[PDB]
Amino acid sequence: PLMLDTAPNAFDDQYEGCVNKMEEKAPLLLQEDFNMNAKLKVAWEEAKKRWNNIKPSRSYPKGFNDFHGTALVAYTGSIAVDFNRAVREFKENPGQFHYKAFHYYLTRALQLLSNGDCHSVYRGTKTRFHYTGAGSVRFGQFTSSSLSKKVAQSQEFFSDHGTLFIIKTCLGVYIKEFSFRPDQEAVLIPGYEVYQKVRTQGYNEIFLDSPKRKKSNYNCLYS
Numbered sequence: 001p002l003m004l005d006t007a008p009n010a011f012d013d014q015y016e017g018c019v020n021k022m023e024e025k026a027p028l029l030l031q032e033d034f035n036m037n038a039k040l041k042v043a044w045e046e047a048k049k050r051w052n053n054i055k056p057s058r059s060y061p062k063g064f065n066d067f068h069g070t071a072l073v074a075y076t077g078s079i080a081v082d083f084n085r086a087v088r089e090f091k092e093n094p095g096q097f098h099y100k101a102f103h104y105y106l107t108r109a110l111q112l113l114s115n116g117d118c119h120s121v122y123r124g125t126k127t128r129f130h131y132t133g134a135g136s137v138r139f140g141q142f143t144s145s146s147l148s149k150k151v152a153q154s155q156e157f158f159s160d161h162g163t164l165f166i167i168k169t170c171l172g173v174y175i176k177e178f179s180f181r182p183d184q185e186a187v188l189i190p191g192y193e194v195y196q197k198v199r200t201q202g203y204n205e206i207f208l209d210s211p212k213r214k215k216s217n218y219n220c221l222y223s
């Protein structure tokens with residue numbers, strides 16, 4: 001069973017007041033991440049190819065470059081697990097975080113694609129989540145969900161040993177056009193969104209409501 005709280009030790013940078021400095025420094029940072037993260041380099045190289053094929057079909061927000069595009073495509077890939085893990089356990093040993101550029105770009109991609117729009121999404125897991133009554137909740141790590149409750153429940157993401165999150169998000173972004181899917185109608189939620197209303201139903205259902213955007217514990221850490 002995993003703990004569901006405010007994610008106090010999760011790298012949650014929102015980059016307030018430093019996107020310009022990051023867009024300039026992130027390119028070098030990505031290289032540094034690569035030199036010490038083979039899996040990421042490979043994951044990224046593959047995502048870049050897919051991105052090239054996706055890019056022509058639609059137009060993107062002003063400032064949405066290939067880094068943003070590639071990062072988002074990669075996330076819907078297999079690099080997602082190790083990346084969320086690295087973010088979730090950041091405070092532990094913050095010296096071994098080789099997703100400095102990656103985190104920024106994915107974070108920026110969602111902000112550039114973000115609107116005021118709120119959605120009703122669902123997320124399934126095969127690992128039981130226990131709300132530890134902090135008062136509110138944040139996923140910490142980026143979290144993917146689906147507009148389809150049926151998808152979140154499919155044997156692909158959920159099981160009796162797990163949990164089904166019923167979430168109302170307002171920072172979440174519809175990334176169908178980016179995923180390798182795109183039938184899972186995925187909505188990517190930043191780990192820094194705060195749910196002021198938490199409710200547990202039965203042993204495997206958790207409702208997250210009253211989404212709000214509050215400051216993060218980290219800000220422009222690598223700017």
Ligand SMILES: NC(=O)C1=CN([C@@H]2O[C@H](COP(=O)(O)OP(=O)(O)OC[C@H]3O[C@@H](n4cnc5c(N)ncnc54)[C@H](O)[C@@H]3O)[C@@H](O)[C@H]2O)C=CC1
Nearest residue numbers: 002076077080081084122123124144145146152157184186
């Ligand atoms: N889960 C869903 O309902 C949906 C998933 N997807 C896609 O499926 C693929 C996999 O997504 P996920 O299953 O969400 O993988 P994910 O990266 O969230 O899974 C991370 C894993 O690490 C562990 N973990 C997660 N949070 C933790 C925490 N707070 N504390 C301790 N351990 C934790 C668990 O084993 C968890 O399954 C991605 O491409 C995702 O976008 C798309 C639509 C819906």
